[PDB]
Each structure stands twice: as C-alpha cells, then as structure tokens.
From Swiss-Prot, chain B:
This is RNA polymerase sigma factor SigA. It comes from the Bacteria. The chain holds residues 209 to 351 of 528 of the full protein. Belongs to the sigma-70 factor family. RpoD/SigA subfamily. A motif (Interaction with polymerase core subunit RpoC) lies at residues 111-114. Interacts transiently with the RNA polymerase catalytic core formed by RpoA, RpoB, RpoC and RpoZ (2 alpha, 1 beta, 1 beta' and 1 omega subunit) to form the RNA polymerase holoenzyme that can initiate transcription. The sigma-70 factor domain-2 mediates sequence-specific interaction with the -10 element in promoter DNA, and plays an important role in melting the double-stranded DNA and the formation of the transcription bubble. The sigma-70 factor domain-2 mediates interaction with the RNA polymerase subunits RpoB and RpoC. The sigma-70 factor domain-4 contains a helix-turn-helix (H-T-H) motif that mediates interaction with the -35 element in promoter DNA. The domain also mediates interaction with the RNA polymerase subunit RpoA. Residues 87-143 are annotated as: Sigma-70 factor domain-2.
Swiss-Prot record, chain C:
It comes from the Bacteria. Signal peptide: none annotated. This is DNA-directed RNA polymerase subunit beta'. Belongs to the RNA polymerase beta' chain family. DNA-dependent RNA polymerase catalyzes the transcription of DNA into RNA using the four ribonucleoside triphosphates as substrates. The lineage of its organism: Bacteria, Bacillati, Actinomycetota, Actinomycetes, Mycobacteriales. The RNAP catalytic core consists of 2 alpha, 1 beta, 1 beta' and 1 omega subunit. When a sigma factor is associated with the core the holoenzyme is formed, which can initiate transcription. Disulfide bonds: none annotated. The gene is rpoC. It comes from Mycobacterium tuberculosis (strain ATCC 25177 / H37Ra).
Swiss-Prot record, chain D:
This is RNA polymerase-binding protein RbpA. Forms a complex with the RNAP catalytic core and with free principal sigma factors. Keywords: Transcription, Transcription regulation. The keyword Iron does not apply. Binds to RNA polymerase (RNAP), stimulating transcription from principal, but not alternative sigma factor promoters. Coiled coil: none annotated. GO terms for biological process: positive regulation of DNA-templated transcription. InterPro entries: RbpA_sf (IPR038638), RNApol-bd_RbpA (IPR025182).
Amino acid sequence: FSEIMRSTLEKDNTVGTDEALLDIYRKLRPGEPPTKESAQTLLENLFFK
Amino acid sequence: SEALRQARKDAELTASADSVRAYLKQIGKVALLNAEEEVELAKRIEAGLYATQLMTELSERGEKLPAAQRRDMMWICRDGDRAKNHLLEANLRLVVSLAKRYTGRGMAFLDLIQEGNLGLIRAVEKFDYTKGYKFSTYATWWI
Amino acid sequence: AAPVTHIWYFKGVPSRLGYLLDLAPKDLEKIIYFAAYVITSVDEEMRHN
Amino acid sequence: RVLRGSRLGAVSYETDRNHDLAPRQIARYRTDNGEEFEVPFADDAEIPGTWLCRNGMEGTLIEGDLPEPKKVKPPRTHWDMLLERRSIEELEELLKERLELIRSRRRG
Amino acid sequence: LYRRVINRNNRLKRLIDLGAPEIIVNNEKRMLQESVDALFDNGRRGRPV
C-alpha cells in the first residue's frame, strides 16, 4: 500500500538472497573475503543469537 | 564473478592505513616450504660459507685465480645468501604466529615482530639439518 | 640511520611536500611508507642514443 | 591532600664568583670527519686521548700520542657458528658437490 | 615516545650492520618513520598511540 516501498522495490538493483547477503557482508566487513553462508549466520548472530 | 574479486582487491587498498596490515599483506606473498627444501637451502648456505672461507684463505697471496672456477665459486658464495634470505622470508609467517600471543602488554606489536625476526636470524644461523628435525622446532626457542 | 619526513609538511592541508613535488598525497603516502618505489633519476641521453 | 615530590638533584646556593676560579686547561679533540672540539679540563688532570665528543662519534686527541686502537676481538661469525659444529672435509664435500652441480648445469 | 624512537633506531642500525633481507629493513624503516610521527604529533596519521 505505498509508492514508497514500491519505489524502493524498483530501486532494488539486486534480486536474489545471496547477492544481498554478500553485499551486506561487503558493506559490513570491508577488507575481508566474502562467503555466502557466514553472511546469513553473522546477521543471525548479530540480531537473533 | 569478477565483482567479488574486484571488491576484495579494491577494498584492501583504500582501507590500508595499518602498517601491520601492510606487513601482513607483504609476508603473504612468499610461499611456505618443506623438509627437503629446507635441507637443500641449508646445504646451499653452508656451501656459500665454505666458499667465502676459501676466498678468505685466498685473500692473502694464496693463488692466482682460475677464471671460470673463480666466477662460479663466487656464484656459490653469493647464491647461499639468496637461499638464506629465501628461508628467512619463508619463516617470517612462523615469527608472526609465535609472536602474536605475547601482545597486549609491555610493548607494541611490530616491535615484537622485529625482535622475533632478529631471533629468527640467529636461529637460521645456528641451525643444523643433520640432526634431521623440523626447522620450526629449533627456531621456536630462539624466537 | 635513515631519513625521516617531518609530518607537518606531509599530513596537513594542503600537503606542502605534495605541492613542492607536484605529486598526489595519496600516492606520496605510498612512497614514504614504503608501499611504492619511485624513479628519482634517469639518464635520458643514454637511453636516447 | 597536599602531595610533593623531589627532582633528585642538589640545589646549592653560593655566589657566582666570576673572578676567582680554579685555573684550567683546554685540550683540542678531533673526530673522524674533520671536526674540532676543545674540551675544558682542569690543570691537575691527565688528558685522555680517546673521547666521546659533542658530535657524538668518537673523537681522538689532536696530538698523535697513539692510544691503543682496538685490542679487541670480533664477536662471533656465522663461519664460527658453522665451524664449531661441522667438519672442513664435510664442507669440502658440499663444495665439490655444488661445483660438479654447476658443471652439470652449465656445460651439460 | 623517545624510548620507542631510540629502540627502533638501534634495531635498524644493528640490522644494517648485520646485513638483513629487504622486507625486515623496510618494515623497520616504516616503523621508524611512524615513531617519529608519533613523537611529533600523535594521532595525526591513522591511529593515536
């Protein structure tokens, strides 16, 4: 129900979970080689563990 | 696929303000070695030491030098230092891995690294291969 | 035993060494902190002939 | 509440008598890289030949009265670390091995 | 800071008088440079000591 979220959903530029995870890992840990599995768990560790 | 490679190799250059990080990325270049390579490097070093000792007893009025024999014995003399420095650059990572657990007290980290490097120089001087052990075991003491 | 740059001519604004040499400060830091070699002289006529 | 300290140094209080002093000598000391230093010694004082000057390097006395130069030993060489644990015949075996090695590498 | 400078200077001097491979030499030179930098203005470059 918002053109706000629809505008952001069309400003997505990345479709796919693992691409978003590695982008987060890139922007969170820069200076570090990426791995797609630890990116989902570190986010799970940082907010849910 | 090249986006992740470009990210991992471009984020390192921008963020590089740490001299420790610079030294780690420096020492990550030279590959490790194994036992027979260490034995061969020790042989080359000892060959260079006996070559420069032969040049030392030459250095008086010992002999007029044969030409090809002179130039390749000086090759032997200079080549042992290459083996020496190669082994040093190999075991820099061992120096770091031993020195890492003494930090957080007394001194800075790079100073401990450099003192461990000097101890590694002393160990690679006084190392023997004929006892047939790993270099790391004998070098850990001096480090 | 080794020369040292005074920091007030390197890490201010603007970089005094950077203007005096007309080099980039972000490349001069790679020079003085041993991250990059730099050619300081060359024999142009010897190469030229 | 009040706390004090002490710089470990004596503070004596006399008058700055500019006229009446112990008379004194001046000895010219020369360093290696052509530097002159003149050091005020007392009259009743033996003048040492060797000296650590204001330059910081070693400075000798300008008259050549010949102090003893080294009279010391080299500490220990890498050759000495090798020779205290190996045989010269063994080192000869390794040398002839490497010579025949560069032979076989070079001309066949 | 002065003790850091004197220690790194003497370490560099002993490395030169010994003859040392290149990486350790440039490491000690950069450490000497950063020591003089911390002597003059701590926290000017990078991280304050």
